[PDB]
Design a protein around this nucleic acid. Structure first.
Ligand code: MG
Ligand code: MG
Ligand code: MG
Ligand code: MG
Ligand code: MG
Ligand code: MG
Ligand code: MG
Ligand code: MG
Ligand code: MG
Length: 54
RNA sequence: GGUCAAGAUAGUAAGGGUCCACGGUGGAUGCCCUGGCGCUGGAGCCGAUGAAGGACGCGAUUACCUGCGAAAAGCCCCGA
C-alpha cells in the first residue's frame, strides 16, 4: 500500500508541474512539501527493512 | 599749426614659448583588509560497502558557485 501512498504525491507533483509550466503556480511551497512527504514515506520503508529481518 | 624732406621709434600674432590659475586623462603615493608567506605544534592514509576526480541532474523563477542525488539547496534518530 505504501506505493499507493507514494504515487498520489507523485501525480499531484506532476499535474502541479504542468500548472507551473502554464499560467498558474500560486503556492510554490506545496511543491517541496509533497517532495518531503515522498522522502519521509521512503525513509520509513527503510526502517521496516532491517527491523524484524535483523 | 599745414604741407614737403631727413631721421628715429611703437603697436598687429596666424601660431609659438616661460610662468600662473583652473580642469581632463591616468592610477603612483598614503591608509585599510576579505588574501597570502614562514616557523612552531598538532594530526596523518583513502578505496569492491565504489576511492581520489569528474559527467548529468535536483530550485516557483537558476547562467555561475555552494550543498545535495531521482527519496535529490535535502530524508530519519540524538544532544546542544
Ligand atoms: Mg588663434
Ligand atoms: Mg587617464
Ligand atoms: Mg596611510
Ligand atoms: Mg591572515
Ligand atoms: Mg564522488
Ligand atoms: Mg531543482
Ligand atoms: Mg553544479
Ligand atoms: Mg530509489
Ligand atoms: Mg532535532
Amino acid at each position: 500500500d505504501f506505493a499507493k501512498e507514494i504515487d498520489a504525491r507523485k501525480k499531484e507533483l506532476m499535474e502541479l508541474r504542468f500548472q507551473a509550466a502554464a499560467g498558474q503556480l500560486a503556492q510554490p511551497h506545496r511543491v517541496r512539501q509533497l517532495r518531503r512527504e515522498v522522502a519521509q514515506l521512503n525513509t520509513v520503508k527503510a526502517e521496516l527493512a532491517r527491523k524484524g529481518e535483523q
